[PDB]
Design a protein around this ligand. Structure first.
Ligand SMILES: Nc1ncnc2c1ncn2[C@@H]1O[C@H](COP(=O)(O)OP(=O)(O)O)[C@@H](O)[C@H]1O
Ligand SMILES: Nc1ncnc2c1ncn2[C@@H]1O[C@H](COP(=O)(O)OP(=O)(O)O)[C@@H](O)[C@H]1O
Lengths: 767, 770
C-alpha cells in the first residue's frame, strides 16, 4: 500500500533522472543523432540494438550477464546511453522496472566500503520516500532489475577482492561487490550489461558471460546517415560525403564513430580543402585541437594557450599512471587547472547518473586524455627524454607513471607521441619548445626505439601489441624508418585474425609491410577490412604471396579493385574470400584474374552469393588458366547450370587438384556434366560434393565417368539422399579403380544392415 | 409431356429457393444495399479494361459458350461472395442471365466437408435442390442440355486437391470424390459446355486451374464514389451518412481502408463509436478489427476484453485448428468438441452458412474468413497453450501449434501474421495487458516477432515473389514500430521497385510509405497498373522524399491527386521523374504542373499521355515550361492539345536549354501547329526527338516543317507516321534533308503513298523510314 506508492514514486524518479542524463551528448539531441552501429554476436551473426537481450529471437533471462566489447571510440558509452533513454522514455526494454546506470571509473574512485543498498541508493538514485520498503521490493524482484556498468576495463581488481559475500546490506569493497553480482550471489537473475575495451576482457570474467557482443563501428552506409543527421544546412552533408569518397584514408578513419564526430565538428575547416586532408589519427586530433583553440594564427595559435595545454596534459598523464580517469574539485586545484583551462573544452562534466550535485570532471573522451598526455610528454621541460623509452619498452616520476599506466592506454599514447614527432607535426609544434633542438632530441629517442621495436617483438615468442607498433611507425610518417624496422625480419606468415583490423589499421600495415623483402602470407581473417580497407592495403599487395580475407564484409567493388592491382603483382598467388558479400557482379574480374595471371594458385570463394549466372562467366577465364590448383565454392549456389559450365572448362584443365562445390544445390544434371569431366580430366585429385540433391541417379552417372578416370583420389558425397542402389553402382565401379583413396557417404539414408554390407564390400567407404 | 412438366416444376423450385437464399445478407435487403464494385477483365494488351456486373459472360459485346470457365479473383473482403449472390438473385428473379435454365450455387468450403463420395446427380439434387417430381427425367434433360446450366463455386481456394483426385471420370451417376468431380467438370468430361463461375483469392491454385480458364476477371473493390453510396444506402437516419462521409474525407488512412467493402461494412457497423471520437481514429487494419471486437463485446476497455477472455480464447482455438486443417465450416459435433458453449456463439463471431435457415442444427462458420484469421492471431498472442517457436512459423525463420501453422494455407497464414504483428504493437499491447498470464507475457512474444520481421525483407530478396513482399511490408506497418521499419530496410540496396499488377490500393500505400521512407539510397518506385487513386497518393506522401522517380500509370488518379502530389514534390530534392500515363487528369491540374516546371529546378521527366488535357491547359503549363531549364523528356501521347496548344508549347521550347524528347502523338494537330513547331526548330538547339504521329498535319504542314528544318542542326529523329502526307510533302521534306547532316531517322509509315512513289522515296534517301 504505502509500500506500493513508495516504489511507484521511485520508479518515476529513476526514470525522470535517467532520461534527463541520457537525452543529450557530452559531445544536439540523442534521439536525432544516434546512427546505428554494426553490432555482432559471437557464434558471427549481425543484429540490431533492440535485440540486446534477445539476440536469437527470445527474451532469455538465462544469460543474465551480457558483454559488449569494442575499440576506444567504437560507440559503447553512446550505445548504453540510447538503451537507458529507450527505457526511461518507456519505448523499449520495458521488461525492467528499474535500470541502474553506473560508470565504473566513478565507482573505482569511491573510498569507503559499500553495500548493495548504498550502491543503488547513494551512488545512483536515492528514494525520496520509503527507502527500506523500496529496497525490499528490489530484493524480492531482482529479475526486474537491469544494471549497466560502462567501461568495465577501468576497474582494478585484486585477489583480496575475489571473495564470497552474500548480504545485500553488509558493506564491502566495490570490487568484491560486483564479483558477487556476477556470481549470482547478489540480486540473482538481475540483468547486467558490461561494456569494455578488447584487452581487458578476462579468463575468469568470460567465465560468467552468457552472451558476448562486438561493436565494430559505423558501416560505409552508416557514416553517410550520421553526416546527413548532423548537417541539415542545404547540401553541406553532400559535400562532406563527396569529400570522404575522394579521400580514402580519412573515409576509412570515419568507420570509428569518434572520428565521424570529429569530421562533422571540423567540416568547415575541411571543406576549405587547403592543403591536403588529414590521413593519420594524430592528424585528426591536431585538427580538433585547433578547432577548439580557434573558438576560445597556426603554430602561433598553439603557442597562445601552451600553458593551459601543458597543465591539462600533466593532469592527463598523472591520470593515466594512477588509473584515474575522473577528477574531483580538490584534485583539479592540486593539478592547478584554472577555469580558463576548463573552458577550453577538453574537460567536461562527468556524465553519470549519481545523486544531486556535484559531479567530478573527466576528459572529453579517454583518447583525448591519451593525446594530451602525449602532448605534455613531447613539450614539457619537466619530462626527461630518457623516460620516453617506457612508451616502447627499450627511475623518475614520469617513468614511474608510464610503468603503472594500463597497456591499452599506453599504446594509444605511444602512437600519438610518434605522430607528434612526425616531420610536419614537429614544424607545427616548433613555436612551443624552450630549446630550438628540443623536439629533435625527443625524436632521436623515439625513432631509435621504433627502429628496433618489431625485431624486439618477434624475438620474444602477442599480435595485438604488434599492430600498435605498426600504427606508431605509420603515425610518425617516416618512410626510411618503416624500411629500417622490417630490415632483416624474415617473416613468412603473418596471423592477424580477430585483431579488430579496420581501414585505418590497413593504411598502417600497407605503409610498413610494403618494405618487406621476402613476400608474405598475410592473414586478416575475421576482421572488418571492408572495401575501404582493401583500397588502403593496395600499396603492400606486391609484397604478398597470399592474401586471406575471410569474414571481412568485402563486396564486388572491393574485389574488383583488388584484382585490378593484383594483375600487376607477380608475388601474389593465393586469395581467400570466404564469407563476404560477393555476387555475380565480380565474375568478370575473377575471369580476368584466371585468364591473364599465369602465376595464380588458389582461390577460395565460398559463402558468398555467386549463382549459376556468374559461374558461367568465370568458367570462361578458367579454360584459359593453366596454373590454378585449389578452387572453392562451399556454400554458394552455382547449381546444375553452373556446375556444368565449370565441369566443361576443367576437363581440359592441366593443374587443378582440389575443387569444392559443397552446398551448391546441385542435382543429377550437374552430376552428369561432372561425370564427363572425370573421364577426360587427368589432374583433379579431390572433389567435394556434399550437401546437395545428387540422388541415386546422380551417383550412377558419376560412377560411370569414374570407370574411365584414374587421377581422382577423394570423392566426398555426404548428405545427397543416396540409397543402397546408388551406393552399389558406385562400389562396382570402384572394384576396378586402383587410384581412389577415400569416398564419403556419411549422413545418407541406409539401413544399418545396408551399412554392414557396404563397409565389407569396399574398405574405403566412410560411415 | 410429363418430362417437360417435371422440368418446369423443377425450374420453379430452383428459382424460388435460389431467390430466397440470395435476397438477404435480417434487417438488410440485398437489392437495397448492393453498391457496384470495380470489375476488370484481364487482357494481354495489359491495361485491363473495366465493365459492369451484367457483362460477366459477355465482356466484349457478345455471349460465348467458348469460355465455359470464368474466374473472378479478388482480395479477401473484395466482395466476391456478394457479387455471386447478386448474380444468383438477378437470375432467380428473371432479371438477367436468362440464357441459363438452371443455376446451381455451391459453397466450396461446405462441399469440402462432405464425407461420402458423390455423383453429378447427387451433387445437384442432394447438395443443391431435390426435384419434387420426375427426378430421373429432369436429370436426363440436364445431361441433354448442359449448355443451359450455370454452376457457381464460391471460394474455390478452400478446396484441397490431390494427385489421387486428378483422374478421369466420365459417368454422371457413378459416385466419386468431390474433387475429381470438379476436375472432370472443368475438363469438359461432365456437362460439356455448361458455364462455371469460380471465385478465388489471388494466390490460390492457379496452374492447372488457369490452364482451364478462358476468361479472368479482377474484383478491385469500391471506388471513392462507391463508398459514399454504400454509406448513404446503409444510413437513412437524418444526416448520419453525411457525418461519416465527412469523417472519412478528414481521416485519410481510414477512408483508404474503406475501398475494400469489408472495411466499409465495419465502419458502418461502428459508426456510433467512431462518431463519438475522443480517442484517435483507427488507421491500421488491426485497429479496425479491434474496434469491431469491442463493438461486439459492448452488446453482449481492456477490462472489457478481459471480461470475455475465456470465450475469445475458445473461439481463437477453434479458428486456429480450422486454419491448420483447412476447415472453415463447423458441425454441431465439432463445436461441442472445441467446447464452445452458446454464450460463445451468441457473442456473434460465428454465423450460419449462407443458404441455411436460422437455428436449425446447421453447421457454422466465422463471420468472415478474416475474422477466423484475426481470432487465430488473438489466441496465438494470449493463450498459455501457445509457444513462441510457433510464432516463428508465421514468418518463416515441434508442437501441435507449429504443426497446424505448417499446414495452414499461405494466404491465410499471411493475414494471420499481419494481425499477430498488429496485436503486438505498442498501443495494442497496452489494450491486451489485462489478458496475459504473466506481466511480461506479451513482451516475450514481441521479442520473437520483432526479431523475425527485422530479417524478413533481407530473407526475401536473398531468394530471387512481389505479392509476398507486399505482405511483409504490411506486417511491419501493422506493428507500428518505426525503429523496426528502419532495421528491416537497413542495408537493402534497392534501386528499382517493381510493384505492377500487385493489387496496390491506399491501405497498401500507407504501409509502403511507413517502410520505404527509411530507405537510404533513393528509389525508382513503380506502381503502374494498380488502383492507387487520389487517396493512395495522400498515403504515399511520407516516402516521396525517398523516391528518385515515381511511376503511376493506369492508377485512376485525378487532378486532386496530382496537385496534392506536386505540393509535396516541390520539397523533395531526390524526386526527378513522374509518369502519369492513363489517368483522369484534366486542364484543372495545369496550374500545379506549371509550378513544378517553374520552381523545381532539377526535374527531368514528365509523361502525361492518355489523360484529358486540351488546348486550354497546354497554354497554362507552357508558362512554367519557359522558366524551366532542366526538363529532358515530356510526353502528351493521346491528349488533345491541338493547334493552339501545340503553338504555346513550341513558343516556350524554342528558348529551352535542356529538352531532348517531346511526344505530341494523337493530339489532333494541323498545319497551324506545324508552322509554330517549325519556328521552334530554327531556334531550338537542344531538342533531339519529336514524335508527331497520328495527326492531320497534311502536305501543307510537312512543308513549313521542312522549312524550319533547314535552319535546324540539333534534331535527330522526326516521326511523322499517319498524317495524310502525299508524295509532294514527302519531296519538300527530302530536298531539305539533302542539306541536313544531323538527322538520323524520319518516319513516314502508314501514309497515303502509292507503291511506286514509295520505292522512289525509299531509294532517294536512306533516312526516310516507310
Ligand atoms: N551510435 C552512435 N551514433 C552517433 N554517434 C556516435 C555513436 N556512437 C558513438 N558516437 C560518437 O562517438 C563519440 C564517442 O563514442 P563513445 O560511445 O564514447 O565510444 P566509447 O565509449 O566506446 O569509446 C560520441 O561522443 C558520439 O558523438
Ligand atoms: N458489392 C457490394 N455491395 C455492398 N456490400 C458489399 C459488396 N461486396 C461486399 N460487401 C460487404 O462486405 C462483406 C464481405 O464481402 P464478401 O463478398 O464476403 O468478400 P469476399 O467473399 O470477396 O471475401 C459483405 O458481407 C458485405 O457486407
Amino acid at each position: 500500500e504505502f509500500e506500493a506508492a513508495a516504489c511507484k514514486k521511485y520508479m518515476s524518479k529513476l526514470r525522470t533522472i535517467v532520461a534527463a542524463q541520457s537525452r543529450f551528448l557530452s559531445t544536439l539531441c540523442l534521439e536525432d543523432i544516434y546512427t546505428e552501429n554494426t553490432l555482432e554476436v559471437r557464434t558471427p551473426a549481425a543484429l540490431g540494438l533492440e535485440e540486446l537481450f534477445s539476440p536469437n529471437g527470445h527474451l532469455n533471462e538465462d544469460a543474465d550477464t551480457v558483454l559488449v566489447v569494442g575499440e576506444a571510440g567504437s560507440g559503447k558509452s553512446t550505445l548504453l546511453q540510447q538503451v537507458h533513454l529507450l527505457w526511461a522514455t518507456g519505448q523499449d526494454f520495458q521488461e525492467f522496472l528499474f535500470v541502474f546506470p553506473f560508470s565504473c571509473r566513478q565507482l573505482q574512485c569511491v573510498a569507503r566500503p559499500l553495500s548493495v543498498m548504498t550502491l543503488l541508493f547513494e551512488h545512483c538514485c536515492w528514494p525520496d520516500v520509503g527507502q527500506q520498503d523500496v529496497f525490499q521490493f528490489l530484493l524480492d524482484h531482482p529479475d526486474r532489475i537491469l544494471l549497466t556498468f560502462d567501461g568495465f576495463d577501468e576497474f582494478k581488481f585484486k585477489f583480496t577482492d575475489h571473495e564470497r559475500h552474500c548480504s545485500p546490506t553488509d558493506p564491502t569493497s566495490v570490487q568484491t561487490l560486483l564479483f558477487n553480482l556476477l556470481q549470482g550471489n547478489l540480486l540473482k537473475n538481475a540483468r547486467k550489461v558490461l561494456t569494455s575495451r578488447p584487452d581487458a576482457v578476462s579468463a575468469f570474467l568470460r567465465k560468467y558471460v552468457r552472451t558476448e557482443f562486438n561493436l565494430k563501428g559505423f558501416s560505409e552506409e552508416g557514416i553517410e546517415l550520421y553526416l546527413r543527421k548532423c548537417h541539415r544546412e542545404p547540401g553541406v552533408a553532400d559535400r562532406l560525403i563527396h569529400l570522404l569518397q575522394t579521400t580514402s584514408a580519412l573515409h576509412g578513419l570515419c568507420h570509428l564513430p569518434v572520428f565521424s564526430w570529429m569530421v562533422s565538428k571540423c567540416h568547415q575547416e575541411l571543406l576549405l580543402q587547403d592543403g591536403g586532408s588529414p590521413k593519420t589519427t594524430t592528424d585528426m586530433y591536431l585538427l580538433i585541437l585547433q578547432h577548439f583553440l580557434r573558438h576560445a594564427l597556426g603554430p602561433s595559435l598553439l603557442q597562445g594557450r601552451l600553458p593551459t595545454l601543458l597543465r591539462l596534459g600533466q593532469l592527463a598523464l598523472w591520470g593515466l599512471g594512477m588509473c584515474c580517469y575522473v577528477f574531483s574539485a580538490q584534485q583539479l586545484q592540486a593539478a592547478q587547472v584554472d577555469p580558463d583551462d576548463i573552458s577550453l573544452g577538453f574537460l567536461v562534466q562527468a556524465q553519470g547518473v549519481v545523486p544531486g550535485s556535484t559531479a567530478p570532471l573527466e576528459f572529453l573522451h579517454i583518447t583525448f586524455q591519451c593525446f594530451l598526455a602525449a602532448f605534455y610528454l613531447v613539450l614539457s621541460t619537466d619530462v626527461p627524454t630518457a623516460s620516453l623509452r617506457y612508451l616502447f619498452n627499450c627511475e623518475s616520476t614520469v617513468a614511474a607513471l608510464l610503468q603503472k599506466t594500463e597497456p591499452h592506454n599506453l599504446q594509444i599514447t605511444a602512437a600519438f607521441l610518434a605522430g607528434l614527432l612526425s616531420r610536419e607535426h614537429r614544424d607545427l609544434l616548433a613555436a612551443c619548445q624552450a630549446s630550438e633542438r628540443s623536439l629533435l632530441r625527443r625524436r632521436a629517442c623515439a625513432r631509435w626505439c621504433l627502429a628496433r621495436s618489431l625485431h624486439k617483438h618477434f624475438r620474444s615468442i602477442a599480435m595485438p601489441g604488434f599492430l600498435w607498433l605498426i600504427r606508431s611507425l605509420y603515425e610518425m610518417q617516416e618512410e626510411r624508418l618503416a624500411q629500417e624496422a622490417v630490415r632483416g625480419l624474415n617473416v613468412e606468415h603473418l596471423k592477424l585474425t580477430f585483431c579488430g583490423v579496420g581501414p585505418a589499421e590497413c593504411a598502417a600495415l600497407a605503409f610498413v609491410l610494403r618494405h618487406l623483402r621476402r613476400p608474405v602470407a598475410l592473414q586478416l581473417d575475421h576482421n572488418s577490412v571492408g572495401d575501404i580497407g582493401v583500397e588502403q592495403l593496395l600499396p603492400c599487395l606486391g609484397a604478398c604471396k597470399a592474401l586471406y580475407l575471410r569474414d571481412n564484409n568485402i563486396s564486388d567493388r572491393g574485389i574488383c579493385k583488388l584484382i585490378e592491382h593484383a594483375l600487376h603483382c607477380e608475388q601474389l598467388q593465393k586469395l581467400a574470400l570466404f564469407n563476404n558479400k560477393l555476387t555475380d557482379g565480380c565474375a568478370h574480374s575473377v575471369a580476368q584474374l584466371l585468364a591473364c595471371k599465369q602465376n595464380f594458385l588458389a582461390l577460395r570463394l565460398g559463402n558468398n552469393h555467386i549463382t549459376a549466372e556468374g559461374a558461367q562467366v568465370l568458367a570462361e577465364g578458367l579454360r584459359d588458366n593453366s596454373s590454378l590448383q585449389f578452387l572453392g565454392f562451399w556454400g554458394n549456389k552455382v547449381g546444375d547450370k553452373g556446375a556444368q559450365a565449370l565441369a566443361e572448362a576443367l576437363s581440359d584443365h592441366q593443374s587443378l587438384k582440389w575443387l569444392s562445390l559443397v552446398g551448391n544445390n546441385i542435382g543429377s544434371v550437374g552430376a552428369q556434366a561432372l561425370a564427363s569431366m572425370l573421364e577426360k580430366n587427368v589432374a583433379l585429385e579431390e572433389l567435394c560434393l556434399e550437401e546437395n540433391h545428387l540422388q541415386d541417379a546422380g551417383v550412377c552417372s558419376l560412377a560411370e565417368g569414374l570407370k574411365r578416370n584414374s587421377s581422382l583420389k577423394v570423392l566426398k558425397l555426404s548428405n545427397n539422399c543416396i540409397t543402397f542402389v546408388g551406393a552399389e553402382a558406385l562400389l562396382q565401379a570402384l572394384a576396378s579403380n586402383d587410384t581412389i583413396l577415400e569416398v564419403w557417404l556419411r549422413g545418407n539414408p541406409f539401413s544399418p544392415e545396408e551399412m554392414e554390407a557396404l563397409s565389407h564390400r569396399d574398405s574405403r567407404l566412410l560411415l
